[PDB]
Swiss-Prot record, chains A, B:
<feature type="cross-link" description="Glycyl lysine isopeptide (Lys-Gly) (interchain with G-Cter in ubiquitin)">
    <location>
        <position position="55"/>
    </location>
</feature>
<feature type="domain" description="SH2">
    <location>
        <begin position="6"/>
        <end position="98"/>
    </location>
</feature>
<feature type="modified residue" description="N6-acetyllysine">
    <location>
        <position position="55"/>
    </location>
</feature>
<protein>
    <recommendedName>
        <fullName>Growth factor receptor-bound protein 2</fullName>
    </recommendedName>
</protein>
<comment type="similarity">
    <text>Belongs to the GRB2/sem-5/DRK family.</text>
</comment>
<comment type="subunit">
    <text>Homodimer. Associates (via SH2 domain) with activated EGF and PDGF receptors (tyrosine phosphorylated). Interacts with PDGFRA (tyrosine phosphorylated); the interaction may be indirect. Also associates to other cellular Tyr-phosphorylated proteins such as SIT1, IRS1, IRS2, IRS4, SHC and LNK; probably via the concerted action of both its SH2 and SH3 domains. It also seems to interact with RAS in the signaling pathway leading to DNA synthesis. Interacts with SOS1. Forms a complex with MUC1 and SOS1, through interaction of the SH3 domains with SOS1 and the SH2 domain with phosphorylated MUC1.</text>
</comment>
<comment type="subunit">
    <text>(Microbial infection) Interacts (via SH3 domain) with hepatitis E virus/HEV ORF3 protein.</text>
</comment>
<comment type="function">
    <text>Non-enzymatic adapter protein that plays a pivotal role in precisely regulated signaling cascades from cell surface receptors to cellular responses, including signaling transduction and gene expression. Thus, participates in many biological processes including regulation of innate and adaptive immunity, autophagy, DNA repair or necroptosis. Controls signaling complexes at the T-cell antigen receptor to facilitate the activation, differentiation, and function of T-cells.</text>
</comment>
Length: 101, 101
């Protein structure tokens, strides 16, 4: 197993936008630890000339979700959204960022 | 910025032990998403011929901690424990795993 290329920890929201702006393909994303909401995660995704931000929500048991379907881990939430759009306005599917070697 | 080499998402506790057992230096670690406690994180660390597991605890606001000092993110908790032992029985400091290229 290898570490996930999408977990950036505590990077500012603006930094996520700076990074994803340079990505070529829509869907390029990263999970970050919110600075405005300590203890919560945020999902930042590239789409066109913009970067969309989503709150990773939790149900009463601690399961994670964006809209309706929830999971036992961020890992599963991320994988589910690689084939089910994270957006309700466009078909945007998560894909790993082209990491800098 | 680059993704953190310590976040492995949802990997089994046994898999974390398998991986860390191969690491040469004490302190080599990874953060994983608990399978027994969905929504919670676990910290696995190598020490000698064993792999120690810690529950990443949360306070009422969602801050993370192992013992007493708490942080606004897993990222900060991890960095704090690179210079303050995660153990009360041995001086074990977190250090990035020697990732396989
Ligand atoms: C345009 C992207 C998506 C579609 C849209 N996003 C949103 O509504 C954003 C709004 C925002 O960024 N406010 C500052 C949600 C959001 C709110 C705060 C936030 O703070 P940071 O952790 O500091 O970045 C991050 C994201 C949405 O409808 N989100 C849904 C679904 C979701 N899980 O976010 C919602 N608002 O419940
Ligand atoms: C030997 C390692 C450390 C020192 C020790 N660890 C512990 O007590 C472990 C016990 C355990 O693994 N039970 C199965 C805590 C622990 C408990 C459950 C667990 O489940 P998984 O997410 O499925 O792996 C992981 C770790 C401890 O005293 N931990 C403290 C501090 C902490 N934050 O874990 C505690 N138990 O509160």
């Amino acid at each position: 197993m290898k570490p996930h290329p999408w977990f950036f920890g505590k990077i500012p929201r603006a930094k996520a936008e700076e990074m994803l702006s340079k990505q070529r393909h829509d869907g390029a994303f990263l999970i970050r630890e919110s600075e405005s909401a300590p203890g919560d995660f945020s999902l930042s995704v590239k789409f066109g000339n913009d970067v969309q931000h989503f709150k990773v929500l939790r149900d009463g048991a601690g399961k994670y979700f964006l809209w309706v379907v929830k999971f036992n881990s961020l890992n599963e939430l991320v994988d589910y959204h690689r084939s089910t759009s994270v957006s309700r306005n466009q078909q945007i599917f998560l894909r790993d960022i082209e990491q800098v070697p």
